Amino acid sequence: CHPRLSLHRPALEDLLLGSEANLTCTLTGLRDASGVTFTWTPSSGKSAVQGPPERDLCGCYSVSSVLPGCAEPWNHGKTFTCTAAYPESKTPLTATLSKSGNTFRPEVHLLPPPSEELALNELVTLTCLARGFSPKDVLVRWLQGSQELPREKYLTWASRQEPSQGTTTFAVTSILRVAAEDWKKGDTFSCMVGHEALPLAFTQKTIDR
Amino acid sequence: CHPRLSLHRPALEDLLLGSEANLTCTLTGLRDASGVTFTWTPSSGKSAVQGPPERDLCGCYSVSSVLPGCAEPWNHGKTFTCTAAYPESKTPLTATLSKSGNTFRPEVHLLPPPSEELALNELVTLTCLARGFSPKDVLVRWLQGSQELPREKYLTWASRQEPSQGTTTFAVTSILRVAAEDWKKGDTFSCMVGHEALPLAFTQKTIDR
Amino acid sequence: STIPEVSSKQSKQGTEHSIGVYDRLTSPSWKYQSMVLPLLTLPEEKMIFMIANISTIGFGAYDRYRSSEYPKGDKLNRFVEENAQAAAKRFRDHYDYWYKILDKENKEKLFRSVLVYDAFRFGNDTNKETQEANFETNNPVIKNFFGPAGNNVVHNKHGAYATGDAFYYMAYRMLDKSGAVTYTHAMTHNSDREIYLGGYGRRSGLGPEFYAKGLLQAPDHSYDPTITINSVLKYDDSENSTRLQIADPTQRFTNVEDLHNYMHNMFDLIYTLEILEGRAVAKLDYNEKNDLLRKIENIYKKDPDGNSVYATNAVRRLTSDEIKNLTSFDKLIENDVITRRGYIDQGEYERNGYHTINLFSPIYSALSSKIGTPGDLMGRRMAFELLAAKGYKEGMVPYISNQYEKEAKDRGSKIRSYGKEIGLVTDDLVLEKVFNKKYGSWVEFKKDMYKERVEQFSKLNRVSFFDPNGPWGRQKNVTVNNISVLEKMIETAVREDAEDFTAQVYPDTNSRVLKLKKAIFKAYLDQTKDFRTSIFGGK
């Protein structure tokens, strides 16, 4: 397997909720032992953690590196460049990570269930709309009162490019199902959205009958 | 590379709109050229065509076959079983495709844009809900009056497992951006939803102010 | 030959013009005229066959083509007769094409006489084993003709090699198509300094193989997506699909201007495709731009002389500063970038190497050496681009003929090689010569070519085409009328190609952009009967 080196952005939970961000420079296709080096150009007080080789497609070994505590360097604006050397070839493969510019603040539009769905009163199809954001990393979860609902209790789609002119923003929608009596009782339902573009990184839209 | 054979249903556009369905028998992992034989058990008035080889990851050469005019056998209930023999191993792999039982008629719920979104009145975000269907193959479009909008003019999600009790149904959502002037003037908006479970294969939900 | 003029010149017995075998063998300037007696006193059975031509004389034994399932007898005779006639016709067609192309009164030098042989590896009736011969085997062919015709062949391991005044097939066989292709390559080796070039020798640095495979040779197949001229063989047997070449060499070309127009219009299409691909590439992320492009360099390694002029093209992974500078299309020419699609090599393209030039792989680099050797890949690419811009007589040949070597030596640039002083002609000098003052540097010339092509397709483009190349879903109609849709499809294909490029074995033929380029090229080549004009119509 011909190797290739790639970079992965830290999870938005780690970026926002996590105090120290771990940023990864993984290498795949390593057809030899772990005689490899993982070098990070910005040495902002972090160490490259190397793990055991992992079998990639067709069993090729894969070795990865982690730069933890990357939140402050990301807050420092420093871009990351990862260089690796492997026994198979002399030339060192290089990968580069940079800040994604031109971010957009998402808008949250809670969607009440339709009249036909409310007419049945068997269940209410609570829906939420997240729209207008450039990066594809958005955390969306459903909030009931002050208690966060479990992930299995609600359903959400992955982010996709939306039809727009000029600005390349994305949209996300989420669906929650609950008994109709709770909505009519008075207990409201909240749509809690998190995205790194916002300085507060959070937006909440809540409504009830 | 380990050989692997599978069968794929024709596209829903070919299934419903297409007169002659093109069902797919594909083989992956063949470590050699296209010296393979593809046989269809319900070869009733059909011809198997093997085309150019498609190289998958790790160099595993892969070739597929197309069975045209499969709509009538599909309407006849005859299950499609594909047998593939390849030079790498004398044992011929076999793939079986059968009709998907327990088809469920979808419900289409057109959701008007929220009042807060309508308050801005710059653009109203029409929402279409496709819910309650056991099969995962659903085609959804947005119809503007008597004119169908291009797929690039609206965003639609994909089928996904929804939390339900007993029946394994799926829910899909479609979205569209348009100005409030058309909604306020009287130009109504239609959500063109198609699914094979419906005997009419099409359900339309339309509403306006 | 097909032309009535040379047919009249050949039908007469007149020496230096007669096609007759006996006239050639009898006359001097024939290396081994000892063949005349054994070739006249052969035992009655048919052993050897001769294929004559306007410029070459062929020799081969019947026993060369005899095989296991293919034994001797009447069937051997029929096969040999048919293929000897076919090969003779193909050789005649190739040299007729060359006679049409040469018009500097150098065509009168095509009436030479050069001999070619088969491999002396005669087959058996029982097994397909072509055992060699060493002037001592008991095969009657070498007992009667090849023996008395005294000349030893080195019996190379593989590859049909040329000597300089003769030729000998070693691994190929003269009756087959590959025989004709290697024959064109062989005559390019043999007739290079005097015939194909206007009496001027090879360029001071380039070796004999520079002129052999990359250019001035028929494509190895019809599949080959390489910039080359189908000269020898014609084919319309289910080969119309995926032709990518010229079907009828004896009909497409009539004179120099036709070849110049054909190359100019093929480059008109290829420049448009390269412009679209470059525009798509420019708007890309850092990682994709790094993984999808390289940089080409000139390395002046130590020559087998006292000099260091002879340059070697080397492709190296480009650095961060360069890729940062590559912000738009026009910078690609400035920074000498070469695509990775067909030139995956990260080492060096050694001089005197069998290097071809890919058709659909753009080379945005106008790189030229400030010292008098341009290398191989850049050499072939620049030669073909010049042939597109200017005719065969001026352009291409001045680029690689040492034609200006006398004027370069007069201007200076003296050099000593192999113990003798000789002039040195440099890329800037030939650029100043072929274009008197139109272009200051090669970058300007490349930019001007791209620009004129840009307004050219801006004004004109053809209306109807069917080059879908979509998914397995039946897609047939695309009707590209304005190049805007072509640019959009190319950009989308490039963005798709930014992924799935981590393949151990198959990262190139699975690329969408290559398939789209091939479809466009085939559609445009089929729409025009000849190549004719590519961008015709409007908009």
PDB file of C-alpha atoms in Angstrom, chain C residues 312-446:
ATOM      1  CA  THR C 312      18.577  16.275 -17.526  1.00  0.00           C
ATOM      2  CA  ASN C 313      14.915  16.857 -16.690  1.00  0.00           C
ATOM      3  CA  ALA C 314      14.112  15.958 -13.080  1.00  0.00           C
ATOM      4  CA  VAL C 315      10.716  16.164 -11.380  1.00  0.00           C
ATOM      5  CA  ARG C 316      10.742  17.061  -7.687  1.00  0.00           C
ATOM      6  CA  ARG C 317       7.999  17.618  -5.146  1.00  0.00           C
ATOM      7  CA  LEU C 318       7.325  21.345  -5.022  1.00  0.00           C
ATOM      8  CA  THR C 319       7.801  23.438  -1.890  1.00  0.00           C
ATOM      9  CA  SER C 320       5.487  25.538   0.262  1.00  0.00           C
ATOM     10  CA  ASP C 321       6.576  28.909  -1.138  1.00  0.00           C
ATOM     11  CA  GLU C 322       5.893  27.866  -4.731  1.00  0.00           C
ATOM     12  CA  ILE C 323       2.458  26.409  -3.990  1.00  0.00           C
ATOM     13  CA  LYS C 324       1.585  29.562  -2.050  1.00  0.00           C
ATOM     14  CA  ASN C 325       2.610  31.592  -5.106  1.00  0.00           C
ATOM     15  CA  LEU C 326       0.333  29.437  -7.292  1.00  0.00           C
ATOM     16  CA  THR C 327      -2.788  31.516  -6.621  1.00  0.00           C
ATOM     17  CA  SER C 328      -4.176  31.524 -10.180  1.00  0.00           C
ATOM     18  CA  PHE C 329      -3.778  29.944 -13.605  1.00  0.00           C
ATOM     19  CA  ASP C 330      -1.256  32.397 -15.019  1.00  0.00           C
ATOM     20  CA  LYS C 331       1.201  31.686 -12.192  1.00  0.00           C
ATOM     21  CA  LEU C 332       1.316  28.010 -13.206  1.00  0.00           C
ATOM     22  CA  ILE C 333       3.375  28.840 -16.292  1.00  0.00           C
ATOM     23  CA  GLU C 334       5.559  31.138 -14.192  1.00  0.00           C
ATOM     24  CA  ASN C 335       6.465  28.508 -11.591  1.00  0.00           C
ATOM     25  CA  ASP C 336       7.007  25.637 -14.076  1.00  0.00           C
ATOM     26  CA  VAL C 337       4.441  23.161 -12.753  1.00  0.00           C
ATOM     27  CA  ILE C 338       3.806  19.738 -14.291  1.00  0.00           C
ATOM     28  CA  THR C 339       0.801  17.584 -13.467  1.00  0.00           C
ATOM     29  CA  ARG C 340       1.305  14.281 -11.662  1.00  0.00           C
ATOM     30  CA  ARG C 341      -1.301  12.338 -13.640  1.00  0.00           C
ATOM     31  CA  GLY C 342       0.959  10.903 -16.335  1.00  0.00           C
ATOM     32  CA  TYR C 343       4.395  11.889 -15.011  1.00  0.00           C
ATOM     33  CA  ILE C 344       4.159  10.300 -11.546  1.00  0.00           C
ATOM     34  CA  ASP C 345       7.962  10.016 -11.526  1.00  0.00           C
ATOM     35  CA  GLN C 346       9.677  11.804  -8.634  1.00  0.00           C
ATOM     36  CA  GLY C 347      13.210  11.102  -9.862  1.00  0.00           C
ATOM     37  CA  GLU C 348      14.889  12.163 -13.100  1.00  0.00           C
ATOM     38  CA  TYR C 349      13.995  11.575 -16.744  1.00  0.00           C
ATOM     39  CA  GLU C 350      17.427  10.409 -17.857  1.00  0.00           C
ATOM     40  CA  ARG C 351      18.728  11.573 -21.218  1.00  0.00           C
ATOM     41  CA  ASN C 352      18.570   9.029 -24.049  1.00  0.00           C
ATOM     42  CA  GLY C 353      15.423   7.492 -22.612  1.00  0.00           C
ATOM     43  CA  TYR C 354      12.276   6.073 -24.190  1.00  0.00           C
ATOM     44  CA  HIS C 355      10.070   8.832 -22.795  1.00  0.00           C
ATOM     45  CA  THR C 356       6.758   9.666 -24.444  1.00  0.00           C
ATOM     46  CA  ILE C 357       4.541  12.684 -23.807  1.00  0.00           C
ATOM     47  CA  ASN C 358       1.012  12.193 -22.499  1.00  0.00           C
ATOM     48  CA  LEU C 359      -1.838  13.861 -24.361  1.00  0.00           C
ATOM     49  CA  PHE C 360      -4.256  14.701 -21.543  1.00  0.00           C
ATOM     50  CA  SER C 361      -1.639  15.467 -18.877  1.00  0.00           C
ATOM     51  CA  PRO C 362      -1.086  19.250 -18.959  1.00  0.00           C
ATOM     52  CA  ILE C 363       2.441  20.635 -18.822  1.00  0.00           C
ATOM     53  CA  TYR C 364       2.026  24.296 -17.881  1.00  0.00           C
ATOM     54  CA  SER C 365       5.806  24.736 -17.752  1.00  0.00           C
ATOM     55  CA  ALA C 366       7.487  26.924 -20.355  1.00  0.00           C
ATOM     56  CA  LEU C 367      10.822  25.903 -18.828  1.00  0.00           C
ATOM     57  CA  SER C 368      13.861  26.309 -21.054  1.00  0.00           C
ATOM     58  CA  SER C 369      17.519  25.939 -20.167  1.00  0.00           C
ATOM     59  CA  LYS C 370      19.681  29.053 -20.243  1.00  0.00           C
ATOM     60  CA  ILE C 371      22.383  26.578 -21.297  1.00  0.00           C
ATOM     61  CA  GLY C 372      22.160  24.903 -24.668  1.00  0.00           C
ATOM     62  CA  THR C 373      20.317  21.655 -23.830  1.00  0.00           C
ATOM     63  CA  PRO C 374      16.565  21.495 -23.084  1.00  0.00           C
ATOM     64  CA  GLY C 375      16.244  17.881 -21.913  1.00  0.00           C
ATOM     65  CA  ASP C 376      13.848  15.158 -22.959  1.00  0.00           C
ATOM     66  CA  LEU C 377      10.277  15.791 -21.813  1.00  0.00           C
ATOM     67  CA  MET C 378      10.505  19.563 -22.073  1.00  0.00           C
ATOM     68  CA  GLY C 379      12.346  19.009 -25.347  1.00  0.00           C
ATOM     69  CA  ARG C 380       9.582  16.929 -26.921  1.00  0.00           C
ATOM     70  CA  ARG C 381       6.812  19.126 -25.517  1.00  0.00           C
ATOM     71  CA  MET C 382       8.419  22.325 -26.796  1.00  0.00           C
ATOM     72  CA  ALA C 383       9.142  20.728 -30.177  1.00  0.00           C
ATOM     73  CA  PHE C 384       5.506  19.722 -30.620  1.00  0.00           C
ATOM     74  CA  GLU C 385       4.277  23.117 -29.411  1.00  0.00           C
ATOM     75  CA  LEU C 386       6.583  24.827 -31.911  1.00  0.00           C
ATOM     76  CA  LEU C 387       5.364  22.519 -34.684  1.00  0.00           C
ATOM     77  CA  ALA C 388       1.864  23.646 -33.743  1.00  0.00           C
ATOM     78  CA  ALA C 389       2.834  27.326 -33.773  1.00  0.00           C
ATOM     79  CA  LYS C 390       5.086  27.221 -36.850  1.00  0.00           C
ATOM     80  CA  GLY C 391       5.506  24.805 -39.742  1.00  0.00           C
ATOM     81  CA  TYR C 392       7.811  21.806 -39.990  1.00  0.00           C
ATOM     82  CA  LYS C 393      10.575  23.526 -41.969  1.00  0.00           C
ATOM     83  CA  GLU C 394      10.844  26.541 -39.641  1.00  0.00           C
ATOM     84  CA  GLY C 395      10.125  25.437 -36.120  1.00  0.00           C
ATOM     85  CA  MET C 396      10.668  21.959 -34.692  1.00  0.00           C
ATOM     86  CA  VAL C 397      13.639  21.323 -37.001  1.00  0.00           C
ATOM     87  CA  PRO C 398      15.366  24.591 -35.965  1.00  0.00           C
ATOM     88  CA  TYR C 399      14.488  23.729 -32.365  1.00  0.00           C
ATOM     89  CA  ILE C 400      16.334  20.420 -32.629  1.00  0.00           C
ATOM     90  CA  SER C 401      18.661  20.298 -35.608  1.00  0.00           C
ATOM     91  CA  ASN C 402      21.820  22.278 -34.715  1.00  0.00           C
ATOM     92  CA  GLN C 403      20.694  24.370 -37.693  1.00  0.00           C
ATOM     93  CA  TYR C 404      21.659  27.565 -35.866  1.00  0.00           C
ATOM     94  CA  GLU C 405      24.800  25.921 -34.454  1.00  0.00           C
ATOM     95  CA  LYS C 406      26.882  27.721 -37.083  1.00  0.00           C
ATOM     96  CA  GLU C 407      25.271  31.062 -36.229  1.00  0.00           C
ATOM     97  CA  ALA C 408      25.493  30.347 -32.497  1.00  0.00           C
ATOM     98  CA  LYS C 409      29.198  29.583 -32.914  1.00  0.00           C
ATOM     99  CA  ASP C 410      29.613  32.808 -34.892  1.00  0.00           C
ATOM    100  CA  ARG C 411      27.910  34.742 -32.089  1.00  0.00           C
ATOM    101  CA  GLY C 412      30.131  32.909 -29.600  1.00  0.00           C
ATOM    102  CA  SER C 413      29.171  30.102 -27.204  1.00  0.00           C
ATOM    103  CA  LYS C 414      32.266  28.132 -28.202  1.00  0.00           C
ATOM    104  CA  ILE C 415      32.671  24.713 -26.599  1.00  0.00           C
ATOM    105  CA  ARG C 416      35.015  21.732 -26.873  1.00  0.00           C
ATOM    106  CA  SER C 417      33.646  18.182 -26.779  1.00  0.00           C
ATOM    107  CA  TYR C 418      35.350  14.875 -27.612  1.00  0.00           C
ATOM    108  CA  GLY C 419      38.606  16.720 -28.210  1.00  0.00           C
ATOM    109  CA  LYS C 420      37.210  19.101 -30.836  1.00  0.00           C
ATOM    110  CA  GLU C 421      35.760  22.596 -30.677  1.00  0.00           C
ATOM    111  CA  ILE C 422      32.132  22.979 -31.744  1.00  0.00           C
ATOM    112  CA  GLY C 423      29.405  25.578 -31.470  1.00  0.00           C
ATOM    113  CA  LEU C 424      26.633  25.492 -28.888  1.00  0.00           C
ATOM    114  CA  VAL C 425      23.049  26.561 -29.608  1.00  0.00           C
ATOM    115  CA  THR C 426      20.884  27.566 -26.653  1.00  0.00           C
ATOM    116  CA  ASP C 427      17.130  27.716 -26.049  1.00  0.00           C
ATOM    117  CA  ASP C 428      17.100  31.517 -25.900  1.00  0.00           C
ATOM    118  CA  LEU C 429      18.986  31.622 -29.206  1.00  0.00           C
ATOM    119  CA  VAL C 430      16.521  29.385 -31.051  1.00  0.00           C
ATOM    120  CA  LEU C 431      13.663  31.347 -29.479  1.00  0.00           C
ATOM    121  CA  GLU C 432      15.157  34.574 -30.828  1.00  0.00           C
ATOM    122  CA  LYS C 433      15.702  32.927 -34.220  1.00  0.00           C
ATOM    123  CA  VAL C 434      12.436  31.122 -35.016  1.00  0.00           C
ATOM    124  CA  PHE C 435      10.533  34.135 -33.654  1.00  0.00           C
ATOM    125  CA  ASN C 436      12.685  37.067 -34.766  1.00  0.00           C
ATOM    126  CA  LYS C 437      11.489  39.492 -32.078  1.00  0.00           C
ATOM    127  CA  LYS C 438       7.899  38.416 -31.330  1.00  0.00           C
ATOM    128  CA  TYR C 439       8.689  36.844 -27.946  1.00  0.00           C
ATOM    129  CA  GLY C 440      11.344  37.853 -25.439  1.00  0.00           C
ATOM    130  CA  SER C 441      11.309  34.735 -23.267  1.00  0.00           C
ATOM    131  CA  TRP C 442       9.701  31.311 -23.509  1.00  0.00           C
ATOM    132  CA  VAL C 443       7.240  32.164 -20.734  1.00  0.00           C
ATOM    133  CA  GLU C 444       5.940  35.026 -22.874  1.00  0.00           C
ATOM    134  CA  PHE C 445       5.575  32.719 -25.885  1.00  0.00           C
ATOM    135  CA  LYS C 446       3.620  30.139 -23.877  1.00  0.00           C
TER     136      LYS C 446
END
